[PDB]
Write an enzyme that holds these catalytic residues in place. Structure first.
Site, short mmCIF file in Angstrom:
data_model
loop_
_atom_site.label_atom_id
_atom_site.label_comp_id
_atom_site.label_asym_id
_atom_site.label_seq_id
_atom_site.Cartn_x
_atom_site.Cartn_y
_atom_site.Cartn_z
N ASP A 25 33.61 40.29 -12.97
CA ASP A 25 33.07 39.31 -11.80
C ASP A 25 32.40 40.04 -10.77
OD1 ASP A 25 33.17 37.25 -10.12
OD2 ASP A 25 35.15 36.92 -9.91
N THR A 26 31.06 39.96 -10.85
CA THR A 26 30.26 40.16 -10.05
C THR A 26 30.18 39.68 -8.76
OG1 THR A 26 28.14 38.89 -10.94
CG2 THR A 26 28.32 40.88 -11.78
N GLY A 27 30.74 38.47 -8.49
CA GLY A 27 30.80 37.59 -7.37
C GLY A 27 32.17 38.06 -6.72
C1 LIG Z 1 32.43 29.66 -7.57
C2 LIG Z 1 33.56 28.80 -8.36
C3 LIG Z 1 32.71 27.74 -9.12
C4 LIG Z 1 34.34 29.77 -9.26
N1 LIG Z 1 34.96 28.85 -10.09
C5 LIG Z 1 35.19 28.56 -11.55
O1 LIG Z 1 33.88 29.20 -12.16
C6 LIG Z 1 35.99 27.84 -12.39
C7 LIG Z 1 36.88 28.84 -12.96
N2 LIG Z 1 35.63 26.85 -12.65
C8 LIG Z 1 35.51 25.38 -12.54
O2 LIG Z 1 36.28 25.20 -11.56
O3 LIG Z 1 35.35 24.65 -13.42
C9 LIG Z 1 35.33 23.15 -13.25
C10 LIG Z 1 36.66 22.45 -13.30
C11 LIG Z 1 37.94 23.34 -13.23
C12 LIG Z 1 39.22 22.76 -13.46
C13 LIG Z 1 39.29 21.46 -13.67
C14 LIG Z 1 37.99 20.41 -13.76
C15 LIG Z 1 36.87 21.23 -13.68
C16 LIG Z 1 35.12 30.79 -8.68
O4 LIG Z 1 35.75 30.72 -7.62
N3 LIG Z 1 35.03 31.95 -9.01
C17 LIG Z 1 35.55 33.22 -8.70
C18 LIG Z 1 36.58 33.86 -9.52
C19 LIG Z 1 37.56 33.00 -10.20
C20 LIG Z 1 37.39 32.46 -11.47
C21 LIG Z 1 38.41 31.36 -11.82
C22 LIG Z 1 39.53 31.40 -11.14
C23 LIG Z 1 39.76 31.93 -9.98
C24 LIG Z 1 38.68 32.48 -9.25
C25 LIG Z 1 34.51 34.28 -8.35
O5 LIG Z 1 33.92 34.85 -9.56
C26 LIG Z 1 33.53 34.32 -7.01
O6 LIG Z 1 32.62 34.67 -7.33
C27 LIG Z 1 34.18 33.58 -5.64
C28 LIG Z 1 32.90 33.27 -4.95
C29 LIG Z 1 33.26 33.77 -3.38
C30 LIG Z 1 32.59 34.88 -3.02
C31 LIG Z 1 32.83 35.33 -1.62
C32 LIG Z 1 33.50 34.50 -0.86
C33 LIG Z 1 34.34 33.23 -1.44
C34 LIG Z 1 33.90 32.69 -2.60
N4 LIG Z 1 34.82 35.00 -5.30
C35 LIG Z 1 36.04 35.10 -4.88
O7 LIG Z 1 36.99 34.01 -4.78
C36 LIG Z 1 36.66 36.60 -4.62
N5 LIG Z 1 36.50 36.65 -3.22
C37 LIG Z 1 35.83 37.86 -2.56
O8 LIG Z 1 35.06 38.70 -3.20
C38 LIG Z 1 36.12 37.79 -1.15
C39 LIG Z 1 36.71 39.30 -0.66
N6 LIG Z 1 36.05 36.81 -0.39
C40 LIG Z 1 35.47 36.38 0.77
O9 LIG Z 1 34.53 37.00 1.34
O10 LIG Z 1 35.70 35.33 1.29
C41 LIG Z 1 35.32 34.97 2.60
C42 LIG Z 1 35.79 33.56 2.91
C43 LIG Z 1 36.81 32.75 2.39
C44 LIG Z 1 37.18 31.59 2.78
C45 LIG Z 1 36.52 31.01 3.75
C46 LIG Z 1 35.45 31.42 4.17
C47 LIG Z 1 34.88 32.88 3.72
C48 LIG Z 1 38.00 37.07 -5.21
C49 LIG Z 1 38.19 36.71 -6.65
C50 LIG Z 1 38.11 38.42 -4.61
#
Ligand SMILES: CC(C)[C@H](NC(=O)[C@H](C)NC(=O)OCc1ccccc1)C(=O)N[C@@H](Cc1ccccc1)[C@@H](O)[C@H](O)[C@H](Cc1ccccc1)NC(=O)[C@@H](NC(=O)[C@H](C)NC(=O)OCc1ccccc1)C(C)C
Ligand SMILES: O=C(O)c1ccc2cc[nH]c2c1
Lengths: 99, 99
Positions: A25-27
């Site tokens: 996960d590059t994100g």
């Molecule tokens: C961006 C979304 C579309 C993505 N989700 C999906 O692709 C999925 C599974 N799919 C999907 O929803 O498909 C359609 C669907 C699903 C169900 C029913 C019907 C239809 C996602 O959240 N993907 C995340 C991984 C993941 C996958 C599956 C299930 C759970 C988590 C990361 O790859 C991703 O890149 C996110 C993006 C992101 C980056 C930075 C900030 C917020 C969000 N990073 C993360 O969630 C990571 N956070 C971070 O790197 C940090 C440290 N956060 C951060 O900076 O947060 C700041 C912040 C948080 C909250 C509010 C404001 C600021 C985490 C895994 C460690």
């Protein structure tokens, strides 16, 4: 390997002597895995993503193998729906994005 | 490019004559922006992440340039703190993970 992105980039990992699978996960800044016991002392951490924040346990200096490639670093453990390998470990195995 | 992962893999994108920056995100199925002024109508869609589920605004057939690479696909507008290029567009620019 070279991994295309037509499907989720899930790979085999080994942690705590157990084979699991996890998303490259590059994100993700950090690595977050499902509930497990790990060695050493943990500290509480909050991590945020889409949908909000969750509570995890932070374990430092943990050995993990990612497709047989060894990495050592911080592993967060908690109620994630998917095991996530984040950049803190991807960098350790020399993973890059290429286009 | 060949992009290492020591920092977030943010790149320049262009959408509707606006330069933005966005995260090349192999852990995202879909592409999510905080805003644009995408041509009028949208369809609601649910997406999930680590913290729970969020409603987003789905736009289809959106023209985007990612590091000068042209792509066309679905773009979601939703509560993300960072613009996210997900796999639906990463595939179109030939992006792979390599180690
Ligand atoms: C961006 C979304 C579309 C993505 N989700 C999906 O692709 C999925 C599974 N799919 C999907 O929803 O498909 C359609 C669907 C699903 C169900 C029913 C019907 C239809 C996602 O959240 N993907 C995340 C991984 C993941 C996958 C599956 C299930 C759970 C988590 C990361 O790859 C991703 O890149 C996110 C993006 C992101 C980056 C930075 C900030 C917020 C969000 N990073 C993360 O969630 C990571 N956070 C971070 O790197 C940090 C440290 N956060 C951060 O900076 O947060 C700041 C912040 C948080 C909250 C509010 C404001 C600021 C985490 C895994 C460690
Ligand atoms: O694992 C735990 O018991 C625990 C409890 C509270 C918090 C807050 C952040 N991480 C936690 C872990």
């Amino acid at each position: 390997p070279q991994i295309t992105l037509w499907k989720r980039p899930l790979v085999t990992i080994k942690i705590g002597g157990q084979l699991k699978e996890a998303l490259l996960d590059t994100g993700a800044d950090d690595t977050v895995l499902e509930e497990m016991n790990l060695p050493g002392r943990w500290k509480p951490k909050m991590i945020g993503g889409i949908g909000g924040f969750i509570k995890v346990r932070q374990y430092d200096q943990i050995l993990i193998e990612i497709c047989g490639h060894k990495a050592i670093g911080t592993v967060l453990v908690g109620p994630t729906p998917v095991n996530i390998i984040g950049r803190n470990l991807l960098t350790q195995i020399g993973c890059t994005l290429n286009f």
